[PDB]
């Protein structure tokens, strides 16, 4: 029977094959929301054509593409299965995948959602900690769609735009940390240094008032509270590119640094993503734990397992939708405040769209 | 009877009267734990003489000196009053102030504590969130003291080196924030934006692994949680001095931005300090609220009152000490990890000084 409530799961692209790498980059270089370049429509097609081989090469290094869709899918099903039991008033629930930069694109998902004649649509960011350059970019795409199509939504909307401390999210991270610790030589357990590694931001974004760091930082505290401070930690940032200043310390430097100081047992915990992707399988596992770690003489370096197929995360997702629905909330309070320095007009419009929603 | 357990209360401190300003800047500028100056021993006395007028001037605009000492004193007394009741086993307790840059210097307090033959000494940072440039420097001074005097301590030492999420600390902040909201026009309560404001750090420090920003962010979350996200917020940083890059956004810049974008009801919350001082009474109340707020046409700006005399803060302090004693702890787990990139040969020495303590 007919799907009633629709859960839009938002996330950035991940090219599924080396073939999709080009269009991936192209859509990436076109997003005003994440970068203004001179004469953008002209540069992007070229920058993409230029960086395709190297990225291809990275994906090939991890087996030939991104597993983002596969994990979102399974996490999706799990969510739906549970929601259909905890919230039966919301009839059958359906999940859709709105990726920013690869198919199914956000726009395509919305088309499919409209057509299934849903009663209510929920924008569920897959980013627990809110950045304008991630969740905001995804929220903007929804608004822009309806303002490009020219008509307007035939279903009522709302957003779960952040969830950096959801209790089951935290429990998942801790569980995966505990079990990653059990694989460390028992004589070295107490001595394991934990590095929470998050995708970095450029300072120019940080300095504009982006909430990301503060949220990532909360996530980190909650986790360590639950672990009862069993090991010393730091929060470090990865994936810097370019010559500009980014928020540090860089994860590559911290690993290198810790080593030189004789802290040679390191647990990497990727705390800002809910599944594997290039950042973990290439950046962390290959560039860092295999090349870097090696030439600095680490004793042991492990990476806590991405949430991926964990059934408990699947519960987490369901529990968030459920609560969101019951609470009748349209978005978080935080969404209703733009960053005291955006130069971007759509941020207000996009937030209007969610706070102005009927019901 | 004689004092059994001493509770060393560490803080930067500030000039009590205008005359202390020169000596205050002098000791700031000679502290090779936040400053490497060419021929530092000769620039410093001078930089002091040059900056003295303007800083005196600032202190004059706030009544002619810092209250850090009065308040630390009152907190000290209340703490002791309770602790004698809470832990009679640890006999009479006595507090000492050890300021870093003004009298009573860390080193004086130490001479005194030792002169009263205490069985133990607790280094109790009054900065809830750890920075290498604040609590660390205070800890470095204790270790350095013994290395200088060339003797060993006659009392058993330990430390409460951080406490960013103490339940009562959090509770006091919540209370003070609520109290301040009832002072805003009622028609505007739930439109008020909360700007948590904290002393900034130079990126060069952030970038070497300083724990502070992540700890400050943690404190913010706990306060907002307990407030039940009743108002939008941002975490922002104040007190940038110089041409170098600091962690932003800057508090001032953020206030102006908010104003230029129609958010004209701001509550400042000083989240990284336990009492009033220059940062709050001059920077926040005068520079930002009284001047900046007029040129950018704010409607209402307000500041949550510093913890100062709050009786519940005193209870907060006692709980911390008492729990630290019951727990038998030498330091936080977090102190045992120096920040992955420091270049300061002393951090590990200090750390060892506390992790290595007898009893
Ligand atoms: C304004 C802020 C951001 C900017 C400017 C930015 C920039 C970029 C750039 C240049 C790439 C291409 C990667 C490369 O060519 O080396 C990329 C890809 C990517 N971005 Fe972001 N990023 C931002 C924030 C984030 C955050 C916080 C995340 C968290 C997951 C994220 C997720 C990803 C992922 C998974 C890729 C794959 C890129 C690749 O496979 O090479 N982005 N971004
Ligand atoms: C490397 C780290 C830091 C550096 C290099 C630094 C620099 C300075 C400077 C230059 C002054 C004198 C004011 C001036 O000369 O304009 C000062 C004083 C002061 N510091 Fe810092 N600061 C740092 C971190 C912090 C932090 C995190 C806090 C509190 C959390 C703090 C608390 C204070 C206070 C209350 C004053 C009094 C300033 C005055 O009276 O003018 N400092 N520091
Ligand atoms: C990574 C890429 C360089 C591609 C290459 O030559 O390999 C560069 C070129 C243009 C860059 C972007 C542009 O400089 C615009 C943005 C400006 C901000 O100050 C930094 C981030 C910012 C969002 C940049 C991210 C990244 O460094 C980009 C995308
Ligand atoms: C200064 C400017 C960013 C302007 C802005 O942020 O508004 C920079 C950032 C990214 C740069 C471009 C990208 O790096 C891609 C190209 C790479 C070449 O190495 C230089 C030219 C190239 C075409 C760059 C031109 C120019 O230097 C850009 C456009
Ligand atoms: C380059 C050096 C910073 C050294 C460092 O990286 O630690 C800077 C920072 C502070 C500077 C000094 C102090 O600001 C005091 C003086 C102020 C005058 O404006 C210039 C000369 C003056 C005597 C400065 C000389 C020099 O440019 C210093 C010493
Ligand atoms: C405040 C004073 C400038 C006063 C003047 O010249 O009139 C200067 C002299 C030395 C400076 C410091 C030194 O350059 C060393 C520190 C290093 C960081 O990169 C900046 C903060 C840092 C702590 C500086 C802050 C501030 O600008 C200081 C303290
Ligand atoms: S860029 Fe953060 S709200 Fe506009
Ligand atoms: S500077 Fe942080 S431990 Fe040395
Ligand atoms: Cl990926
Ligand atoms: Cl002061």
From Swiss-Prot, chains A, B:
- Provide the residue positions that the database annotates as binding protoporphyrin IX: 51, 59, 66
Q: Which reaction does it catalyse?
A: heme b + 2 H(+) = protoporphyrin IX + Fe(2+)
- Effect after changing residue 347 to H/S: Loss of activity
Q: Which cofactor does it need?
A: [2Fe-2S] cluster
Mutagenesis or variant effect for residue 342 to S: In EPP1; enzyme almost inactive
Which cellular component terms (GO) are annotated to the entry?
mitochondrial inner membrane; mitochondrial matrix; mitochondrion
**Where are residues bearing N6-acetyllysine located in the sequence?**
351
**Record pathway:** Porphyrin-containing compound metabolism; protoheme biosynthesis; protoheme from protoporphyrin-IX: step 1/1
> What does the annotation give as the result of altering residue 132 to S?
Loss of activity
Q: Known EC number(s)?
A: 4.98.1.1
Biological process (GO) annotations held by this record are: cellular response to dexamethasone stimulus; cholesterol metabolic process; detection of UV; erythrocyte differentiation; generation of precursor metabolites and energy; heme A biosynthetic process; heme B biosynthetic process; heme biosynthetic process
What protein name applies here? Ferrochelatase, mitochondrial
Q: Gene name on record?
A: FECH
In terms of the parent sequence, the fragment covers: 65 to 423 of 423
């Amino acid at each position: 029977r007919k799907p009633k409530t629709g859960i839009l799961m938002l996330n950035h692209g991940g090219p599924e094959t080396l073939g999709d790498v080009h269009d991936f980059l192209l859509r990436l270089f076109l997003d005003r929301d994440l970068m203004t370049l001179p004469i953008q429509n002209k540069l992007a097609p070229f920058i993409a054509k230029r960086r395709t081989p190297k990225i291809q090469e990275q994906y090939r290094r991890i087996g030939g593409g991104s597993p983002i869709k596969i994990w979102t899918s399974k996490q999706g099903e799990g969510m739906v299965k549970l929601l259909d039991e905890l919230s039966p008033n919301t009839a059958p629930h359906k999940y859709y995948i709105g990726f920013r930069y690869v198919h199914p694109l956000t726009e395509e998902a919305i088309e499919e959602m409209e057509r299934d004649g849903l009663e209510r649509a929920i924008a569920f960011t897959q980013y627990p900690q809110y950045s304008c350059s991630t969740t905001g970019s995804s929220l903007n795409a929804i608004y822009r769609y309806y303002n490009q199509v020219g008509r307007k939504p035939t279903m009522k909307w709302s957003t779960i735009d952040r969830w950096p401390t959801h209790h089951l999210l935290i429990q998942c991270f801790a569980d995966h940390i505990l079990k990653e610790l059990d694989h460390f030589p028992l004589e070295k357990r107490s001595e394991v240094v934990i590095l929470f590694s998050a995708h970095s931001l450029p300072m120019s974004v940080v300095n504009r008032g982006d909430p990301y760091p503060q949220e990532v930082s909360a996530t980190v505290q909650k986790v360590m509270e639950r672990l009862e401070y069993c090991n010393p930690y730091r929060l470090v940032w990865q994936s810097k590119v370019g010559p500009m200043p980014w928020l540090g310390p860089q994860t590559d430097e911290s690993i290198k640094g810790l080593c030189e100081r004789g802290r040679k047992n390191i647990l990497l915990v990727p705390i800002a993503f809910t599944s594997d992707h290039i950042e973990t399988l290439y950046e962390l596992d290959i560039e860092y734990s295999q090349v870097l770690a090696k030439e600095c003489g680490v004793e042991n370096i492990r990476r806590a397992e991405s949430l991926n197929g964990n059934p408990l995360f699947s519960k987490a997702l369901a529990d968030l939708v459920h609560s969101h629905i019951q609470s009748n909330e349209l978005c978080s309070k935080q969404l209703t405040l733009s960053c005291p320095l955006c130069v971007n007009p759509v941020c207000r419009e996009t937030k209007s769209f969610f706070t102005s929603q009927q019901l």
